[PDB]
Structure formats: structure tokens, C-alpha cells
Write a protein that binds this ligand. Structure first.
Ligand SMILES: Cc1cc2nc3c(=O)[nH]c(=O)nc-3n(C[C@H](O)[C@H](O)[C@H](O)COP(=O)(O)O)c2cc1C
Ligand SMILES: Cc1cc2nc3c(=O)[nH]c(=O)nc-3n(C[C@H](O)[C@H](O)[C@H](O)COP(=O)(O)O)c2cc1C
Ligand SMILES: Cc1cc2nc3c(=O)[nH]c(=O)nc-3n(C[C@H](O)[C@H](O)[C@H](O)COP(=O)(O)O)c2cc1C
Ligand SMILES: Cc1cc2nc3c(=O)[nH]c(=O)nc-3n(C[C@H](O)[C@H](O)[C@H](O)COP(=O)(O)O)c2cc1C
Ligand SMILES: O=C(O)C(=O)c1ccccc1
Ligand SMILES: O=C(O)C(=O)c1ccccc1
Ligand SMILES: O=C(O)C(=O)c1ccccc1
Ligand SMILES: O=C(O)C(=O)c1ccccc1
Ligand SMILES: O=C(O)C(=O)c1ccccc1
Ligand SMILES: O=C(O)C(=O)c1ccccc1
Ligand SMILES: O=C(O)C(=O)c1ccccc1
Ligand SMILES: O=C(O)C(=O)c1ccccc1
Lengths: 334, 334, 334, 334
């Protein structure tokens, strides 16, 4: 029995080898951006509304042509077999059963076709490959397998400096591989190549500048994820939650605006929604649940988040996620 | 001998079973809103006035047609027999003797008629029941028993997620019951039903949004309590003290504006007054005093608060609570 | 050898009985205003100027018709025999020798005439007595003894709630008495009575509201001390340093504007000057020095402060205190 | 193997005598300005750009007529033989090999001619001497030896009060001397004398006021270093990083604007650049590396900083330092 996401972190910390826990937990550099993701959420307070009709409270949203049970998707996290032997299959099954989109990674430890076969209308996260032709072939594989959106990660020209991994001498165990294989930096030209190659919605993950959000809309993106990559890329990058309101105003409904980084409760989902997010991604907590108890762990996490989201929405007077987006917020201290 | 409200918390902590102390102390979720109630008060500084006539300093106010000895009432707190065998009767007797209004709860552990028989011109807190007819019958009981105001709690469509209570497996002992009995979410329609059923002032407790405060006035409320329910309802709800000034400006004398959450001294009462509150509610400290020493404990607490309020008002140059409302404040750090 | 004021606090803490140290160190209530005096100074940063002529750096000021060696006076502190057997005489001698004004207290433990006989052109602090006639007789005594200013304390209608003193059961030892004797709250009428009774400058100590500063000028005050009484009066009163800039702007050279509360270095004196203060008062540190080493201790403290003030002024490009008043500041964090 | 600058501080702390470590680490007074240099950087967050061309990322700049490999120079630090027997020669050799300017000190423990003979196009830091003639002779020596800029330190009319050094009784060992010899306060007249005596760019180090930055341009300075001297001069001086943006706007390209104080990573270099700095100086970390491992230590530090700067720039979408200067920032908390 878990009553908060923090219960799952404690359980994952028990079970995982230290170096693997550090791979999961860590950020780049001094971990300033990692810590700031939490600090930034903790400073946001919601102004709830009272006395509204709550006879049909629903946490559902429509996004990228699909109904989702919550305004949430599982974030792309590479190499999930590091955390449990069933890896991506356990997580994708739990996500499917919960009605939550699952993001299949370019660096998945089980092939994208196997994970897509689980069902649940999955998304696919793209890292740009050595050339256009191979990148587009990977997009086409994902589309052929029934993925419903391409989440193009745009904040990784290369991987950040993860000092925990350097100090630990961390490397993949021989039994964990990039199962989609037997990279070069993305540009706006890469985005255009992807957009022309698929009719699936293209979602740019890792946008923080307002003008990059605008340009994403102009480039034909169906969504963006406002994100500092969980503090794993540029150390000192602003948290996504701190740019979200400005970005939502700037795109002016031109694309879906998601956010990630440090979402650890249904209350945090509500804060994100109140700042204007269409939905959130959740990364580390899903992996804690996977490490702790496999598929059943992830199921319990998603059930817990669903109850927390419903609870927060109703206490704030919101019968729908749209209503939650119209909530006001106030910044506080600590 | 107690010289601060904090002396009473230490005494209550000694005597109470852990699970009962946690029921009393706790908040919802991560307890962010619970902590913020204190943080928010600690950031407020008063700009005192000097050299004013203090020859007849009075802490009295007129509210809901009654003189009160202090700008304070005892907050509604369910199930007071959890804290002392005399429960609500001990607290109501001490409040009566101090000239402070006592709020009788829907979930009182002694019947509202018994508590009202104590005297002291009590108020009645309403939770909306399964239907209109039963809710209105409860209002009529309170009115028939001589209650002078209906404090309609509007922030509890359901009870929040209290993780201390979940972790402790807390439940009422068999010897504590809801003595008014042998609930459904409130709406603005419920408010209207209550307003039409009684000539008593209706006070909406748990308002945080400015437009909800305005709407409360438009709905015929005689007062509101600006409140996040002591951090026990929405985790991440703004503290009432942070919304109070804006709300006072918006209602523009159209109803009484009370505040609660974290009031722990006469100095805090002064801060609330200087931000525009008509009066405060005090919850947890009253229960600490009850746990520590029964009726006499509550008497000592109210005597201590009375002396602190008088002290703070005079040091700030205020011969009346009205003068205290005209004090200016300045936000500081930590 | 002491190299900071903090060295003196450690020495005083060694020697003094605990209850006496607490009488000296403590504030009212939760000590929020006591702590805030320090916090507020620590948030202020100076923008120093470079490359100015420093060939005749002087820390002198003219104030209330007298040259002072530093922009500083010893604050009124009652009952100095609590800290050392020579009490006020030791402090007044050291102040005289340093060229710093000494404020003789109404509640001095040596008679005001004895302390004035030390020399050094002293000031006299007044508490308003039971009636006008006795109050004015005390003012006349001070004037007859050669005091040069009347520092009328206006923030003590009564003494604040000092919880350390209550918890310790603190009372004066039989060997410490109010030597000026064998009180009622001051008002603006009291100020006028004093102003009409003496041609000495009347200085109102304990002003925090801007309109009280204006009114002080209109009332014929020669100065004010912007002060929360070292956090010993209203708990939650804003620090003087936080009101100082606004007050200086409002009085627009109409009277001298001093500040006190938490001045613990020459750097802090510079901050106060840069915010517009004419001079500061220093309280607790003078008593630490007295406790630690009597007259010689106070001499060493004043020599240390003189060197720190000279150092700070020159490093900031200021050849005079007037130049220091023209420095700009910037608020920072922690 | 060092993966952060903090690894080098730990190593230096191991090896150095305590009093020498304190000479290096310490600041003046309470060390408020020392701590604030770090706090101020930690509050700055970068808004990175995505999807830009990074096929030729370069960290090079042109400054004072020379290409530098990074937007960084080694700060002037007196008496480097305190930290390692090779002192300035070890540091200058490593700087030369890394393509980073090295600032030769007036108070170098090896003669300026010997250090200049190392090569690498060095700068020379000037303290104003007892008269104009001797000061100008020192400038001429530096110029004759091939120094390329005169870094005139303008924040040291005298040295600040370093309480660690006072408490330790610190003095130079007999084997460390001011090798350029067998001082008076600088003014704007001194600056003019230097400017007329050399065609080398004159760089004023220790500017914090906006009008001093303007005046520096008007005086013919080729650059300024916005700096509080690592918190070693005025205790309470604003950090340079907090004045940098305002100063950059005010000089409006009229001179190079460098900053120092607390730069401890390539991420911090990026923050400085994004606030408008042309380049940074790095002081203490270079000495940590020197203490830890001599010339090879300094080489490793500069290689580490080069990799961190390249990493941060690319992750932020900047192919050049000019692009980094066009990044936006956002202030956060803690
Ligand atoms: C171990 C780990 C691996 C990750 N791998 C990827 C990846 O392959 N692609 C990607 O776009 N994001 C990746 N992310 C970033 C997440 O998608 C997400 O942005 C971040 O974890 C969200 O923050 P949260 O973990 O605080 O919920 C990874 C994060 C972690 C912790
Ligand atoms: C144990 C407990 C029970 C409570 N029960 C009720 C209730 O039945 N109805 C209600 O409107 N508020 C209830 N409250 C909220 C209080 O009325 C009040 O809003 C809150 O406690 C004020 O904060 P304070 O405790 O910080 O003074 C309760 C609070 C506590 C701590
Ligand atoms: C032990 C003690 C006694 C004091 N007595 C008096 C007094 O008799 N009259 C008065 O105007 N202020 C009195 N003060 C206040 C000081 O004059 C001054 O406002 C305060 O101490 C300044 O702060 P500092 O102690 O932080 O320097 C007293 C302060 C202390 C600590
Ligand atoms: C031990 C030490 C000696 C210094 N000596 C000088 C000096 O002789 N001349 C000068 O202009 N600055 C001097 N500085 C200041 C540095 O040039 C620089 O402004 C400061 O150290 C930059 O901060 P950082 O150490 O945080 O990188 C010295 C600093 C230290 C720590
Ligand atoms: O994307 C990531 O943050 C990440 O940690 C990673 C590192 C190496 C391979 C794949 C993902
Ligand atoms: O940093 C890298 O080289 C790396 O492994 C990578 C991973 C994913 C996308 C781009 C680069
Ligand atoms: O109102 C409350 O906060 C509360 O704690 C409660 C919980 C259960 C029943 C009654 C009150
Ligand atoms: O959460 C509940 O179901 C509950 O017990 C309750 C209590 C008071 C009012 C409304 C609901
Ligand atoms: O003025 C004071 O703060 C003070 O502490 C005091 C208390 C009693 C008598 C005199 C002064
Ligand atoms: O609080 C008091 O009664 C008190 O002792 C006093 C002391 C000085 C001035 C006014 C009152
Ligand atoms: O410039 C300095 O900060 C410094 O520490 C110093 C002190 C004495 C001599 C030379 C430099
Ligand atoms: O403070 C001093 O006297 C000192 O040593 C010095 C050092 C360098 C420049 C100016 C003064």
C-alpha cells in the first residue's frame, strides 16, 4: 500500500543497485535544475473555487486524437530493463490498463514493435539519428506499429554531463541493450523532415524559450513539452513550470502545451493545469513503481495518481480539466 | 502557567495518544498548505503607530448582532471528545466565560442542543447533508437551540487526503460518535436554500477566490471565512492570509470578512486585523488547551490570547479593533 | 583582542548570569522582530564608488549642535549595573573618550547627574511619568546637568511581553535600582509639553510609520530614531531599517533621522548611512563590551567600530558621511 | 581525475596548511559578499534555445587584440608561491598551453619579466604605487616584457579586513616575497596617467556602480571587470553578477565588460555571458588546481572548464559566445 509517490521512491531505493538508482535520480552538473524543478512547483499555490457542480467530475482529456483517462502520459525514459526484468512491457501494460499514453523510447530495451503490440495507443519518442534517411525510417517503423504521436526530443544535441554516472563509472549491463538497433544533433530542418514524413502529430519535447514555442507552432508541431529534461541536460536551465504560463499565452491555442519535471502528485498535476498545461509527463516516479513491484507497481502508482488528481480537481471546484486550466495561482515562499 | 500558545502544544503532545495528536495536527497531502499558513503570517510585519490615546483600549467587536470580547471565535473542530472527556462542553463553557463565540459543529461529539444550553450565544457550523430537507432541518435545530449564525463550510465537497490518518489507520474510538445523528457536496443552490430558510446570518467558510467572495455577498451571505481549512483540504491551496487583503477590497464592506489558519498569538490577530479581517477563527490551539487541562486549559488559553491582543493593539497605537484595521503592513523575508 | 562585535557577544555570554544575558539578548513574543532586525540588514548590499579622493577621510558628523567622532551614539539601555559594577559610569567614560554621544536613561542605575558629570556632552532618554509636572521636572534635571538632547521614547506605552524574562522569573537584584527616583503612556500632547519646556532638541525614538515621521517634524522634533526597540516591544513590528528610506524621503531634511536595531559592524553603519540615516544607535554590543571588560571593553568596542566605519567608508569611496548617504544600495537574498 | 571544480577545492584543502587555505578562501568582515557571489549565480537560470546549427561550436573570443580559447582569463591572485613551489610559472604555463590569458600580478612571487617569458600573451595587473613616476615605470616594465593589457585594480585604496588572517596571525613565509620590488590610493587622475603612458588597453577591475562604468568608458578604458574582489574588500558590496546586466546596458558597447566572483563551472560562464559579459575571470579555483597538482593541475582545471563551457553552450543552442550573450535569463529561488 502506497499513499504518496514518495512511498514508491523509498521502495525503489531499497531494491535498486546504487549506480542504477543514481542513473535514474541524477541530473547534470551540480543538479541545480533538478532541484529547481521541485522548488518551482512548491512555490505555486492554487486559488480553488467553491460551490460548483461536481456531480460528474471527469479527469479525461482528448489529446492527439485520443481520449486519455488523466491529463498525463508516461515520459520517455531510456533502458527500462535497468529497473525490472520486464522493463518497458510492464510499464506499457499498466499504462494501457490505466488509459494513460505510454511514450516508447528510441533507446528502449525492448523493441518498439513489441511494446506497441501491448496496445493502449502508444506514442514514440525520437532521437535524431546519423542522417535523415535512418531517422525517417525509425519514424515510419513507429507509425507502422500503431504509435499515435512522434515526441521529437529537441534538447539533446548530445547527452548532458551526469556526474553521478561519471563518479560511479556507470555503464549498461551486458543484458540491457538498445533493442531498436543492431546520433546527430536535431535542427529545425530535421523537424520539417519529420513533419513531411508523417501525418502523425509531431510534439517537440524540451522547449523552454517563448520564441521556440512560437516557432514550433509555425513549424507545424501538434504539441510541445515545456521541459528541462528533468535537470539532466543543461545544468542551470530554467524549470519548464516557470516558463509554462508565458509559453501558453504565446502559442495562443496553436498547439497542445505539455510540461514535465518534478510532477509528484495529483496536486502538482493540478498546478500544471492551472498554469495552462494541456497535460503533464511523469518520468522518475513511474520507474520507482516499476523497480518496486513491476507491472503491479506501475498500476498502483497510476491508480494513486488518478485518485489524487480527482481529489485535487474536486476540492478546487473543477468538474473537468478545462475548468482546472481556468484556475488562478499565486506564488508563495518556500 | 502558559506564556505562549506554543506552551499548550507541548502539553497536548505529552498527553494525547499519537494517532489523536496526528488527527489534530495534520493536513492533507504533503502538508504544504498547513506549513504555508504559518509561513505566510511570519512574512507579514505591522507598521505600528505611536503617541495615540490609549486611555480606553478595547478589544471588543460587534459581529452578527452580538458583542464579542475579542475579534476571535473558536473554529469548528469535529469530535472534541477525542481530546478530553468533557469535549465540546468544556470548550463552550470556557468560550462563554471569556465572551468569545463558540462554533458548534455538525460533527460534534455532544449534541448541538446540549452545547447550546451552555449559553454564550454560540454559532453553528453546517455540512451539507444527503438532501435539502435534512440539511434545512439541521439548520432549524440550530436556530431553535439559540445559535446566532450559520457557518456553512463550503470547502468540503468531501474530506481531503490526510496521510497521517491513513498511515496510522486512524478511526474514531467506539466512545466518540457524531452526536447530532442517529453528506453531499454543497453548491450555490445549497447556499440559497439555507439563506431562504433562516433569518440568521449565513457565513461561508472556506472562500479563497476573490470572485467567490463577491458572489458570497451577492448571494446574501452575512460573512465569509477566508480559509484553506487549516491545510486539511486541497494540498497546495493558497493560505487565507495571502488572499485576505484582496478579498477585503473586493467585498467593500458588503459582509464581514474573517480569516483563519495558523493564528497562534495576539500578534497574529493584529496582523489579520491590519490586513482587513473583521475577526479570526482559532482551531488547533483551542484543542491543545482542551487536551492539556480541559475547561480550565481553554480558559487559560483565552485569557492569554486576550492579554496578547490587548498588548499588541496598544503597542501598535490602536485603542479599538477598527483602528487596528487601519494599520499598514509590510512583507519581509523568513 | 576583539576583531568583530561578535567576539564581544561570546565574551559577555561567558561572564554574565544566564537570566541577565537573557534580559539583554531577548525580545518580545516569538522574537520575530528581533531576528528581522538582523535579516533586514543582511539583505542590503552597498554599491561602492571607486577612484575618489580619500586623502582626508573623516567619520565625523555634526548633530544636535555637537561634533561626534562617528555617525553613532550609545543607545539608551536601562540598568547598566546589571552588566558590570561600574555600570553607566564605565560606558559614559568610554563614550566620552571616543567622542561618541552617550544616552543617559530615565531608568539608569546611577543618577543622571553623576553620569553627566563624566562629561562628553551626553543625551537624556525620557520615559513619560505619571503626570506632566514630574515628567517636565525630569527633563529640567537633565538640561540643568548639561544633557544636550532629549530622546523621548515613544514606543513604550508599557513594556512588551519578554518571554525569556517571564520564564526565568527575572527581577532586578536588590543592588540594582532606578537611581533617578526615590509611568503613563506618552501622546502627541506629551511631546508638545516637552518641546515647550526646553530649548534642547527633542528626538522621538521608536517611530516606524511614515506619517508619524512627518508628524514628528510638524511637532517640532529635532530628530527621530526609526526603531522597533530592538524587537523588545511589538513582536511583528517592522524593522526600522526597512522603513528608513521611505521616512528619509518623507521628512525631506526637516529633522535628523537616526536608525537602530541590529547594527553590528562598521559595514552595517555604512548600510544605514546609504539608506539615508544621519546616524545610528548601538545597544546590545555596548553592553557586551561592558560585561566583558568594563570601561576598557567599551573603549575597545568603540575603537573597533571606528576602524570598521573608516574602512567601510573608504572602500566605498566616501571621504565623508555625507558622501556615504549618497551611496546606492541593492536588495539581495539571504 | 576531476569532474567538477569542487573536486579541486577538496584536494587543495587536503594539501595546504590551514592558514594558507584561509588566506585563499577568505573574505572581509562577515564574508557576506563572499557568500553572496555564489548565491547570486545560483539564482540565475538560463533560457536555452533549441534546434540551432551546432556543426562548428566555438568557445573562442577576440579580446584586447588577441584570440582567447575561452571567454575566460586567470584572475590576478597575489603570491602564488604560497600554493605551490612553481607558483606563477606553473599557472602561466598551463594558461598559455590552454590559450587562456594569464594576469601577472603587481604582488607576484616571481618577477613579471620571468612570468612574461613563459609566453602566452599575458596581461598585467597594477596596484597604484607611492607616486605617479614609480607606478608608470611598473606599467612600462610590463609593456616592455610583452604584456598585452593593463588590469588596473581600482577597489583597493587599501586591503580589506580579512578576519581569518587576523585570527590566524597570517604573514608571508620568509621564502615568499613580492618579486617585482627590492602603495597609495588610485583616483581617476591615476587612470588618466596610465592611459597617457601606454597604448595598451587599460582595464579597470573592481567597478560596481553604473556611473563608474560609464565614467570608465569616458576615461578611455578598453574594459572593466565588474567585481567585488571576491568578497575580500568591502564586506556588504553587491556581487558583480548582480550589477552586470545594468552595466552592460549603460556602457552600450563602449568597452569590454568582464565579470568575476564565484565562477565555478562552464554553466556559470554561460550565465555570465547570458547577462552580457564579454568574458569572466576565475581566481580561487585556479589556485586550488595549482595547490593540488601544480602545472598539470591547472591544465586539468582548464581542460575541464573548456569541456563544461562547450557543453553548456551547445545545450543552450549557442554556436558562439556572441550567441550566448543573446540568451535570456530568469531569476529563481535558492
Ligand atoms: C533515467 C532517465 C532516462 C531518460 N531518458 C530519456 C529519453 O531517452 N528521451 C527523452 O526525451 N527524455 C528522457 N528522459 C527525460 C524524461 O522524459 C523527462 O523529461 C523527465 O524525467 C521528467 O521529469 P521527472 O522525471 O521529474 O518526472 C529521461 C529521464 C530519466 C530520469
Ligand atoms: C481536527 C480538526 C477538525 C476540524 N473539523 C472541522 C469541521 O468539522 N468543520 C469545519 O468547517 N472545519 C473544521 N476544521 C477546520 C477549522 O475550522 C479551521 O479552519 C482550521 O483548523 C483553522 O486553522 P488553525 O487550526 O490553524 O487555527 C477542523 C480542523 C481540525 C484541526
Ligand atoms: C536590555 C535593554 C534595555 C533597554 N532599555 C531601554 C530604555 O530604557 N529606553 C529606551 O528608549 N530603549 C531601551 N532599549 C532599546 C535600545 O535603546 C535600542 O532601541 C535597541 O537595543 C537597539 O538595538 P540593538 O540592541 O540591536 O543595537 C533597551 C534595549 C535593551 C537590549
Ligand atoms: C588569495 C587572493 C589574492 C588576490 N590578489 C589579488 C590582487 O593582487 N589583485 C587583484 O586585483 N585581485 C586580487 N584578488 C581578487 C581576484 O582577482 C578576483 O577578483 C577574485 O578572486 C575573483 O573571485 P573568485 O576567486 O571567486 O573566482 C585576489 C583573490 C584571492 C582569493
Ligand atoms: O535522456 C536522458 O536523460 C538519459 O538519461 C539517457 C542517457 C543515455 C541514454 C539514453 C537516455
Ligand atoms: O551524447 C551522446 O553522444 C549520446 O549518447 C546521445 C544520445 C541520444 C541522442 C543524442 C546523443
Ligand atoms: O473538517 C476537518 O478538517 C476534519 O478533520 C474532519 C474529518 C472527519 C470528520 C470531521 C472533520
Ligand atoms: O469525505 C467524506 O465522505 C466525509 O466524511 C464528509 C464529511 C463532511 C462533509 C462532507 C463529506
Ligand atoms: O526598554 C527596554 O527594552 C527594557 O528592556 C526595559 C525593561 C524594564 C525597564 C527598563 C527597560
Ligand atoms: O510596562 C510597565 O508598566 C513599565 O514598567 C514601564 C516602563 C517604562 C515606561 C513605561 C512603562
Ligand atoms: O588582493 C587581495 O585580495 C589579497 O588578498 C591580497 C592581500 C595582500 C597582498 C596582495 C593581495
Ligand atoms: O592595505 C595595504 O596597506 C596594502 O597592503 C595594499 C596592497 C595593495 C594595494 C594597496 C594597499
Amino acid at each position: 500500500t502506497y499513499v504518496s509517490l514518495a512511498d514508491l521512491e523509498r521502495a525503489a531505493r531499497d531494491v535498486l543497485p546504487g549506480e542504477i538508482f543514481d542513473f535514474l535520480a541524477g541530473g547534470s552538473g551540480t543538479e541545480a535544475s533538478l532541484v529547481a524543478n521541485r522548488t518551482a512547483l512548491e512555490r505555486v499555490f492554487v486559488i480553488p473555487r467553491m460551490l460548483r457542480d461536481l456531480t460528474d467530475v471527469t479527469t479525461e482529456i482528448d489529446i492527439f486524437g485520443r481520449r486519455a483517462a488523466l491529463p498525463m502520459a508516461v515520459a520517455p525514459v531510456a533502458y527500462q530493463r535497468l529497473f525490472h526484468p520486464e522493463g518497458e512491457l510492464a510499464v506499457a501494460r499498466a499504462a494501457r490498463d490505466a488509459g494513460v499514453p505510454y511514450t516508447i523510447c528510441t533507446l528502449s530495451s525492448v523493441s518498439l514493435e513489441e511494446i506497441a503490440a501491448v496496445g493502449g495507443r502508444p506514442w514514440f519518442q525520437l532521437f535524431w539519428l546519423r542522417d535523415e534517411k535512418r531517422s525517417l525510417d525509425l519514424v515510419r517503423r513507429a507509425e507502422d506499429a500503431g504509435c499515435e504521436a512522434i515526441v521529437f526530443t529537441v534538447d539533446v544535441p548530445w547527452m548532458g554531463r551526469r556526474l553521478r554516472d561519471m563518479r560511479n563509472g556507470f555503464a549498461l549491463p551486458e543484458w540491457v541493450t538498445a533493442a531498436n538497433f543492431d546520433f546527430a544533433p536535431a535542427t529545425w530542418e530535421s523537424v520539417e523532415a519529420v513533419r513531411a514524413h508523417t501525418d502523425l502529430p509531431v510534439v517537440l519535447k524540451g522547449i523552454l524559450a517563448v520564441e521556440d514555442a512560437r516557432r514550433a507552432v509555425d513549424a507545424g508541431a501538434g504539441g510541445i513539452v515545456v521541459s528541462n529534461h528533468g535537470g539532466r541536460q543543461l545544468d542551470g536551465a530554467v524549470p519548464g513550470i516557470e516558463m509554462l504560463g508565458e509559453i501558453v499565452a504565446a502559442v495562443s491555442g496553436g498547439c497542445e502545451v505539455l510540461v514535465d519535471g518534478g510532477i509528484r502528485s495529483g496536486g502538482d498535476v493540478l498546478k500544471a493545469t492551472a498554469l495552462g498545461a494541456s497535460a503533464v509527463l511523469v518520468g522518475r516516479p513511474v520507474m520507482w513503481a516499476l523497480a518496486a513491484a513491476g507491472q503491479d507497481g506501475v498500476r498502483q502508482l497510476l491508480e494513486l495518481l488518478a485518485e489524487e488528481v480527482r481529489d485535487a480537481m474536486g476540492l478546487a471546484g473543477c468538474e473537468s480539466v478545462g475548468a482546472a486550466r481556468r484556475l488562478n495561482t499565486k506564488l508563495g515562499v518556500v
